Design a protein around this ligand. Sequence first.
Ligand SMILES: NC(=O)C1=CN([C@@H]2O[C@H](COP(=O)(O)OP(=O)(O)OC[C@H]3O[C@@H](n4cnc5c(N)ncnc54)[C@H](O)[C@@H]3O)[C@@H](O)[C@H]2O)C=CC1
Ligand SMILES: N[C@@H](CCCCN[C@@H](CCC(=O)O)C(=O)O)C(=O)O
Length: 367
Amino acid sequence: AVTLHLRAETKPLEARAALTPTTVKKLIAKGFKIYVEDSPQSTFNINEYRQAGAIIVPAGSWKTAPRDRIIIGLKEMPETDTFPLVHEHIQFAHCYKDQAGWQNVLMRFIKGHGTLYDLEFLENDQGRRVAAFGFYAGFAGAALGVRDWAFKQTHSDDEDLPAVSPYPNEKALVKDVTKDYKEALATGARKPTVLIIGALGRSGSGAIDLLHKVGIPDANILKWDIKETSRGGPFDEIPQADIFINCIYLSKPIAPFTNMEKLNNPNRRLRTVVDVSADTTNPHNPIPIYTVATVFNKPTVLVPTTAGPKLSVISIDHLPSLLPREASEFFSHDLLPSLELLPQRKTAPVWVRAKKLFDRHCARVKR
Ligand SMILES: NC(=O)C1=CN([C@@H]2O[C@H](COP(=O)(O)OP(=O)(O)OC[C@H]3O[C@@H](n4cnc5c(N)ncnc54)[C@H](O)[C@@H]3O)[C@@H](O)[C@H]2O)C=CC1
Ligand SMILES: N[C@@H](CCCCN[C@@H](CCC(=O)O)C(=O)O)C(=O)O
């Protein structure tokens, strides 16, 4: 049989779960044994998992679980966990693109003889991702960006966009954003132009979807992707946009989309940068204008400019947790076919590809 163990998330404010109660109920009917840690931050009630058939165990009991259990979780391990990782782990580890500290992430697996099957690199035969939160991120990102832009029209510069909390549904999020937005227009603010780079992807789509729902007109949205950026940055259309939303998948080293020089300019219209891609700790980050990773409880950081109006960056790295329950159901449904193959993970290509990718990255690590 396969035994799975759903780890309680420890990333602050992370409310999503990698397996939902439905997903657990379906896996049990397929013969899996499933443990679920009682999580204080999860949007799901522990009783939904009880009724699904999960064995309920305490938060962080994965650490002492039998070595045959596959530990599944969404987000990073705490930096302060330094002991060897001995299980097979399914999670997002963000350590295959030379993010700051990537060697330390992998070294725990190397010392424990564990295996990382990274959620981002689970792909079908045709090179496409099997499960992805991108749409919910571009959506949530675009919502906070429009909210920030609107705030800057109706509030003192002294003030920053206040803490956000997760929403019970998209309708309620769109209602908040639409209020702030109409309120700013009512006072004479010009309808914003929004520049989206990576517009054709998952998060680009979610961001266009939000902008439509809130009532920004198609003409006001510049939808850029690889065509439009082949000339290479930095670009002039960024400082002249009202809102810039970065939705690229950064894979190759590229010329930065803008810089401090271009932004220090009295005639800059740009008020809000939504860095959805959020390759903040990447050495090739094509948005080197900030260094802070913002969080729901403090969602914007000031980009200190020497000319032009107050500009802020949003760089929350788990935007989909603004809408935790449906984001989780969406992702787990799309993940399920792969998880059903875990009994055969030694031969199933989706799993094997991911194991071989892990071994090649571990080979790059200094010993
Ligand atoms: N902040 C958060 O909570 C989240 C962040 N993300 C991040 O978003 C990034 C993209 O995710 P997805 O939308 O699923 O990827 P995706 O692969 O669906 O779309 C990426 C788009 O960027 C375009 N692109 C790539 N390089 C470009 C360039 N140099 N110039 C212009 N366009 C370029 C591609 O053609 C593609 O259409 C990921 O790296 C992911 O880590 C995703 C989910 C949540
Ligand atoms: N682009 C960065 C990471 C951005 C943060 C991603 N967090 C997302 C991932 C979801 C997905 O890709 O499906 C999240 O939803 O927690 C990197 O490559 O290191």
